[PDB]
Amino acid sequence: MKKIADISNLNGNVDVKLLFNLGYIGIIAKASEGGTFVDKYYKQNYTNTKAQGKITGAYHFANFSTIAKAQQEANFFLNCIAGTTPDFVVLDLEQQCTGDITDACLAFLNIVAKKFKCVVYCNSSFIKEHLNSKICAYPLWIANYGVATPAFTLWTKYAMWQFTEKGQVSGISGYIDFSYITDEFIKYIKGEDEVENLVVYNDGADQRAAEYLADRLACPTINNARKFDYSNVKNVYAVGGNKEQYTSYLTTLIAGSTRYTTMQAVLDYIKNL
Amino acid sequence: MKKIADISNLNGNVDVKLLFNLGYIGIIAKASEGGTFVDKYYKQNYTNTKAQGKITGAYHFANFSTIAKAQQEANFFLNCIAGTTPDFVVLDLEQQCTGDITDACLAFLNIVAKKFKCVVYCNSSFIKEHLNSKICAYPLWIANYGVATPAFTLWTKYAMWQFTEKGQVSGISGYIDFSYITDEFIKYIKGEDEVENLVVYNDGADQRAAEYLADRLACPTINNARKFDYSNVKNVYAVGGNKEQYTSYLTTLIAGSTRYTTMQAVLDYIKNL
Amino acid sequence: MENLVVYNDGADQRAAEYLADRLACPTINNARKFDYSNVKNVYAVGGNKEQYTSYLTTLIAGSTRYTTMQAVLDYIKNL
Amino acid sequence: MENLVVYNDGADQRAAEYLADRLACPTINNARKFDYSNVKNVYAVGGNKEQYTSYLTTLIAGSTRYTTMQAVLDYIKNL
């Protein structure tokens, strides 16, 4: 799994190339805290990361319990990152609060998500004490230190997992946090859509044969009558019929002269896989 | 194709065994004409035919144009055949009338059909001049003399075809009419239900395999979850699964350990047919 | 057989299967050459009456695949 | 992929296919081990949310196969 670092004003002036030398694919930088705290290193952290072609993130350190306050913080975070275009942004939740703050969190996110892909960062216990599954509309950046594998509730999958808050590199002040970042999340923030396998069929008997192939490939099927954009599919399989019936993106055709030999061809293709 | 004879008072006292010797499987006898004409040989014609174990029919020679009149004739025909239980009965349509008498015919039939399986008898030209496709709710006994194969409109199939009105047997007065009678009609008037082939499957992949078998057998499929009476099906095929899942009437099971070998077994069975 | 449901290849088969579940009966593909003479009720789903056996008892059909399905659910409801 | 419809084996597949026709998209059998992370809208048809990928966007389902189908036609109508 790839890794990403996060930094803030506590780290001072950072040569981000030290981190890129260590293999980190980007930098998530603190932009703001609460309603008025401006991170005075954010701009240069974003700038030097984006300039070098690496992944950028911006995080806001929340201090809200109420909807109103969440909205003020959301507008303030956007004001702090204006003039920068991070790949994604992060609502960092660790504030002292009571009870379930999920609606306030959604109020923040509703504002920010119109401009940036948002992620929610928190630890396992914060989730249990203060959130409900409505939060799961956004991906999770789980902070879980000391564990071999992260454990959390509400979400079933993480986008990033912050595994230490005690990273250290000579020439960078303070501690740096490090995170694993999934290939699914990297695709998401890059706009990368590619579906691996799709099986196409026409109405009738060939649909039977197509489903067997799709079971083997563990993929979807699609009726050829459906107007669909196949430009992003890597392997487009068709079952039955002629090439001329199908998308210009077609790359495998399994077809016989009867419904029965088409089925036999599909079973033969499945065996040879 | 089997044959059946029809007779009336014009034939006098008939030794029906003369006709059974010639191969005729039954006798359709005239019971009545119009609103008041009683065929005085009907009772003995029905009696001697039924006594000998042969097929019986009773026909009424219509003389109606109106609904009211049709109802009077219907009640009169039932009164004439009371004390007899013919296998089926016949509305014989040859009367002089104008226009479309279909509704009057249905009025007759509505009454008689509550007691007996009814058939409509007429020639090609009567159909064109006086009927509409509503009549096709009842089977057709087509009178078409001199032709190698009958031709008619509205209906697509006949139950019986009267091919001559000039039959003659020494010892029977007058002419006798002869008809072909189809195996489908004979089944119908005997209450014989038997379906030849049915393929059963359970929800999922095995349904795909079942449809291929049913295409080959040219028959229906049925989902095994459906509570159904299989007692009348001659060959009950099942695809996938274990014998214990299916009706006690099951006689062929094609099944493998996976969805794919079940499909291969079905294709192998289809080839070996 | 008391009931049978006929469909043509394609979307109407979906609707025919819901009707057959409710009638607890078989379905048959219209392309199959079959003797319908000993079926009491022959239902067809989708399309037009001329595409089907002369033995057809009831045709349930709308002008799109969607209204055909609606008509089959409405038939089921009123049964 | 913008839209995908998931079904479990059986009657719900019928309903899922009408929805996929209207969305002009693929369907996938829930038994298939698949990566849903790059699908914008993941519709499920029939059953309960816990049977499906955590990536589920919308579940359309009633308490019988028939009301599941009705709910899918109603979703289609209001679209």
Numbering used by the authors:
A (entry chain A), B (entry chain A): 1 to 273
C (entry chain B), D (entry chain B): 195 to 273
Passage from the reporting paper:
The CTP1L endolysin from ΦCTP1 targets Clostridium tyrobutyricum, a food-borne bacterium associated with food spoilage in the dairy industry. The CTP1L gene encodes an N-terminal glycosyl hydrolase domain followed by a C-terminal domain (CBD) that shares a common fold with the C-terminal domains of the CD27L endolysin that targets Clostridium difficile, a gut pathogen that can cause debilitating and life-threatening diarrhea and colitis, and CS74L, which targets Clostridium sporogenes. Endolysins pass into the peptidoglycan layer and degrade the cell wall, killing the bacterial host cell and releasing the bacteriophage progeny. The genetically encoded production of the truncated CBD plays an essential role in endolysin complex formation and the activity of these endolysins.
Here, we present a crystal structure of the full-length CTP1L endolysin in complex with the truncated C-terminal domain. The structure was refined to a resolution of 1.9 Å, and it contains one copy of a full-length CTP1L endolysin as well as a copy of the truncated CBD in the asymmetric unit. The full-length CTP1L endolysin consists of the enzymatically active domain (EAD) (residues 1–190) and a CBD (residues 195–274) connected by a linker of four residues. The EAD consists of a (β/α)5β3 barrel, where strand β6 is directly connected to strand β7, and strand β8 runs anti-parallel to the other β strands. The active site of the CTP1L catalytic domain contains a phosphate ion, surrounded by the catalytic residues Asp-92, Glu-94, Tyr-121, and Asp-177. The truncated CBD is closely associated with the CBD of the intact endolysin, in an arrangement that is similar to the CBDs reported earlier for the crystal structure of the CTP1L mutant V195P. The two CBDs are arranged side-by-side, and the buried surface area covered by the truncated CBD is 2560 Å2. In contrast, there is an extensive hydrogen-bonding network between the truncated CBD and the CBD of the full-length endolysin. The close association of the head-on and side-by-side dimers creates a heterotetramer assembly that buries a surface area of 8410 Å2, suggesting that the heterotetramer is the predominant oligomeric state of CTP1L present in solution. An anomalous dispersion map revealed the presence of a sulfur site situated between Val-195 of the full-length endolysin and the N-terminal Val-195 of the truncated CBD.
